[PDB]
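Q: Structure for this?
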Amino acid sequence: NTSNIVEQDSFSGLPFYLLDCSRAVKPLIFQERRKPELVARTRIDDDHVFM
Amino acid sequence: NTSNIVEQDSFSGLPFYLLDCSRAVKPLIFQERRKPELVARTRIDDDHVFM
């Protein structure tokens, strides 16, 4: 068992992180499928407007 | 204090109203925001039409 956490006894606060963001493989991955799509249904002929 | 209402001691019926309408401003006001809007929903892709 190899440890990934360094802990100080009797600590109640906010931790901080060290990362090796030096290669092409970064420790965190963001994955995007579809770009944001914004729709404004502000037309008179709309069904929700009519109802 | 001035009164514009005539009362009878034992009246138990329906009142009638005397008004003056020969001046520039009429005693009553009718205010309109949006004129009547008549629409019909006759498209095959409309939610109600389709369902």
